């Protein structure tokens, strides 16, 4: 029902002007607004499909040659957006699943598939260094729910040859729990 | 507890003589004894560690330059062996997990970690074309049991960078079931 | 009225999951579901056009980078489907016609043109080694019916420069009959 | 007194048409009629010299450019023909000799020399993958008879630098016996 | 019973002198006597085998270094000769078959095979540009007779890998008939 | 039980000094002590394992950079040693077996396996030109004994890909016997 808008610019100045412009243009949520090395700027938006398409169109149009990349990931589960913008709350210490991918796009799709495919909590979708680099999604819940989530997410990523590794941590320890679930 | 002994020869004649020789030498069970393209012969032995080590040593010693490859996989779960030899019986139509790898060495280790870290039935360990090629292991049971099993085995293969793909088929079809479980 | 759906994957695991997925998705019939060397998997579906298109779209979409090839051969004669899946029964020992081609697609189109173009029995459509390799179709009946079938099928394959050879064997040796017709 | 006819074609269709043609042409026995990778077809015939020469001449003439190879192995011992077409019966579990060669031609000559040179039973002449690949002949009988057979056959093959390996299995075990003598 | 003699010279002067010389030498009939691009001369003779052999021998001997090519096509059906020299009369508008080949030799042998192999009328054997270029033969009669003719002729040409295309025109049109049959 | 010690030096002077030194060091017997082309010296010692190991260690230690090669072959049959040193006596004119190899190391191992796995007389182990060159072993006795012997020894050499050829001469000739058995 929802959507992810990705707009990567070759300029920070352009990114901020365009980012502001996109927020005013429709009812969109800015999930990410950061500089990536070696000078590129990243804008990540959440919201209803039409709003995202309108913002990304306004963005790309105004962007001109400053546009590095623009992507619209459609039909995303609601939980995915806050997992991109920050963290989703975990009710209790249970099993943890981590699926590592190449590209935020692949990670988002894996996360989405996991969310539909199970009763897990999608804790967060992390980007180590920009849109094409190592990304990981963290899921929490029953060992069985986490196993299903992990297999589903791995298969999603693996299908596009962008799966790095996926792990299941039943009964994680404190140090790790805080580090996996809270960042 | 058990062990898998792998011996690949550059000659069918050598393979049969060596195969027979290995069977007489210890209390090993011939699991696989076939020709692989483009002329190489494969021998796979099952049994206790010491017997397998003795058999593989006798094999490699007598093999000389005819030896292509020799491998000894120890601390192997019982169920694994007959899944290499042939098929393991499935009590009822439930979920099916398939983990695809590069190398039987890898597939065996995946299948092993599966069985230990689950209540699944390891149906079979298939080699499409020899020891280094595409291999797949088929597990059956609860969707949750298959899910754990599939993940574990995947992470096993993934760690050595030899996972191809892995899939979960809950509620498999009339025809696909016969193919996946019966060969 | 009928259609052929061809899906070739780079993974057996993906092939089985996708194959099962396609069977559930529409009222399609699995004609071929086999591994091809050196690790690629083949899916061939028969059924009504819309069902085949939906199935192949679902297949290709889910396949991602694991997709080797996908094809939808439309407006196929009913008899072609069982000739792909297995054999069609021959009423009586009469003349035999063989048309050899490069690609199962060529072969199917040749077989289809032969079936519409004559009163022959299309015995079988055989693939020696996968979708792009040597294929052959076997027809039986009157020497005249077989001649028409063979010329038609040759002129179909030849048009795309994929005709290998075509032969007419009026009254074959029973040994040859048992081979070409009876499989 | 007898002879082996070898006709290898670049087309399956041509192979079947020509194969049928050869069977009708003279009193010849079709010992082999199979497809070889990557699309070539193999015809192996047994019979009296004149019949074989006539069939191979008819074959090669009609073959034209579709001819890959044609060979006539003359003065072959009767037992060699059924050993090519299938298996020769072994009276009792005794010693087994295996001689491995490159090319069916070399294998046939070695088998023939072994048959004349001893009281062994030539069980079978096997081709792993076509006319030029790994071929092996299996002999059975007394350890002394099998030793003579093996030395003779090895010397034959070795003379043309086409011997791969040759082994003597006195007292083979069941698993192996069934696999060496029955295929 | 009849034969075709082909003599291609590197000189028109030589061709005419040699052409005349052969006509005097035996009871041969000049079928074709024309210049081919880019300066080569072509002579085609019809008659009894011995006469053709004598004429072609005399031709090649006297030709010396001016000889491009010489060929004697033996055991040719009488109807082929006038089909080379000109046209054969068609009794009634029926189906038309066209077999296109590379080389007049391949076309002649296809035409001959078609004539023996059926009750068709061989209308003409056409050469577009010299002995090695595109040639076609036109047959007329029953759709069944024409189909048999076309399959036979195609298999002939195809065997030597010189088949271009072959077509069957049942019920040809007012204008196309005149073109296909009358040149 | 016995051992063969091989020491090849880059100097004749070093070879003689080292040779003498090795004889004094243990209860080893000098089997071979000769110059090889193009200046290298060869020493072959016979005796009990420990003595041979001590001798070869003393040899290699004192040899320094003058060492070309050193080898210790253990579990050698008595008969082998004098067949290296010179000739073994043949009781009567019977069948003769000759097994030709690359390297004396290989020839010795072949000759060994022969003697253990037969009742043949190992007549001699000949080196045409040094340790790595053509070597042959001559066995005599029953055709059956020679046959077993020849095969065993061949399979030994073949396994290391160092068999050249092997022959069986039942009923050898007046002159050839003297050459084969007496040198
Ligand atoms: Cl910033
Ligand atoms: Cl949700
Ligand atoms: Cl177990
Ligand atoms: Cl139909
Ligand atoms: Cl076949
Ligand atoms: Cl016989
Ligand atoms: Cl001894």
What domains sit in chain F, N to C, each tagged with a CATH number?
1-78 (3.30.70.1710), 79-183 (3.30.70.1710)
Q: How far is the CA of D160 from the centre of ligand 6 (A)?
A: 24
User: Which value in Å is the resolution of this experimental model?
Assistant: 3.2
For A165, name the nearest residue in chain B, comparing CA atoms only. B158
Sheet of strand D2-9, all strands in order from the earlier edge strand to the far edge? D28-35, D41-48, D2-9, D67-76
Q: Is D43 on the interface with E (CB under 8 A)?
A: no
Q: How far apart are CA C24 and CA C18, in angstroms?
A: 10
Q: How far is the CA of F80 from the centre of ligand 7 (A)?
A: 7
Of C158, C167, C168, the CB nearest to E165: C158
**Chain A closest-CA separation from residue B171 CA (Å):** 14
Q: How far apart are CA F117 and CA F149, in angstroms?
A: 7
Q: How far is the CA of A130 from the centre of ligand 1 (A)?
A: 13
Q: Which ligand is nearest to the CA of A15?
A: 1
Q: How far is the CA of C13 from the centre of ligand 4 (A)?
A: 34
Contact B129 C24 (CB under 8 A): no
For D18, name the nearest residue in chain E, comparing CA atoms only. E159
Residue C61: count other Cβ atoms within 10 Å of its Cβ: 11
Contact C39 B134 (CB under 8 A): yes
Burial class (CB in 10 A: 0-12, 13-18, 19+), C81: buried
- Asked if A77 and A133 count as a contact pair (C-beta separation under 8 A), the reply is no
Q: Which ligand is nearest to the CA of A2?
A: 2
Q: Is B181 on the interface with C (CB under 8 A)?
A: no
Among B residues 62-101, those touching chain D with beta carbons less than 8 Å apart:
66
* Structure tokens belonging to residue E62: 């006297």
Q: Which residue has the tokens 């994957």?
A: C9
Instruction: Compute the C-alpha angle C99/C104/C105, nearest 5°.
Output: 100
Q: Over the Cα atoms of chain D, what is R_g?
A: 16
Count how many pairs of residues, chain D against chain E, have C-beta atoms within 8 Å.
13
Q: How far is the CA of D35 from the centre of ligand 5 (A)?
A: 5
Of B13, B19, B38, the CB nearest to D176: B19
Q: Which chain D residues touch C165 with a CB distance below 8 Å?
A: 11, 13-14, 66
Contact D65 E159 (CB under 8 A): yes
For F162, name the nearest residue in chain B, comparing CA atoms only. B65
Q: Is F158 on the interface with D (CB under 8 A)?
A: yes
- Asked if C170 and C123 count as a contact pair (C-beta separation under 8 A), the reply is no
- Asked if C18 and C7 count as a contact pair (C-beta separation under 8 A), the reply is yes
Number of helices (H) and strands (E), helices first, in chain A? Answer: 6, 8
**Which pairs from E165-168 meet CB under 8 Å and 24+ separation?**
E165/C155, E165/C158, E165/C159, E165/E100, E166/C151, E166/C154, E166/C155, E166/C158, E166/E97, E166/E98, E166/E99, E166/E100, E167/C155, E167/E97, E167/E98, E168/C148, E168/C151, E168/C152, E168/C155, E168/E95, E168/E96, E168/E97, E168/E143
The full DSSP string for chain D is -EEEEEEEES-HHHHHHHHHHHHHHSSEEEEEEEE-TTS-EEEEEEEEHHHHHHHHHHHHHHHGGGEEEEEEEEEE-TTHHHHHHS----SS--EEEEEEEESHHHHHHHHHHHHHH-S-EEEEEEESSSTTSEEEEEEEE-HHHHHHHHHHHHHHHHHTT-EEEEEEESS--HHHHHHHH--
Q: Is F159 on the interface with B (CB under 8 A)?
A: yes
Q: How far apart are CA D125 and CA D136, in angstroms?
A: 6
**Chain D closest-CA separation from residue C106 CA (Å):** 15
Q: Which chain C residues touch E150 with a CB distance below 8 Å?
A: 147, 151
Q: List the single best residue of C149, C154, C160 to mutate versus E (max E Cβ within 10 A).
A: C154
Q: How far apart are CA B54 and CA B73, in angstroms?
A: 13
Q: Which chain F residues touch D165 with a CB distance below 8 Å?
A: 155, 158-159
- Asked if C125 and C46 count as a contact pair (C-beta separation under 8 A), the reply is no
Q: List the single best residue of B12, B40, B43 to mutate versus D (max D Cβ within 10 A).
A: B12
């Amino acid at each position: 029902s929802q959507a992810i808008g990705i707009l990567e610019l070759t300029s920070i100045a352009a990114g901020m002007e365009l980012g502001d412009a996109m927020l005013k243009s429709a009812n969109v949520d800015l999930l990410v607004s950061k500089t990536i090395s070696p000078g590129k700027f990243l804008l990540m938006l959440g919201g209803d499909i039409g709003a995202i398409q309108q913002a990304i169109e306004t963005g790309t149009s105004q962007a001109g040659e400053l546009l590095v990349d623009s992507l619209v990931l459609a039909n995303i589960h609601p939980s995915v957006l806050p997992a991109i913008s920050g963290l989703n709350s975990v009710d209790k210490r249970q099993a943890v699943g981590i699926v590592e991918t190449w590209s935020v796009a692949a990670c988002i799709s894996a996360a989405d598939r996991a969310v539909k495919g199970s009763n897990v909590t999608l804790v967060r979708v992390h980007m180590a260094f920009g849109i094409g680099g190592k990304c990981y999604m963290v899921v929490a819940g029953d060992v069985s729910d986490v196993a299903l989530a992990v297999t589903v997410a791995s298969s999603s990523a693996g299908a596009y040859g962008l799966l790095v590794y996926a792990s299941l941590i039943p009964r994680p320890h404190e140090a790790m729990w805080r580090q996996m679930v809270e960042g």
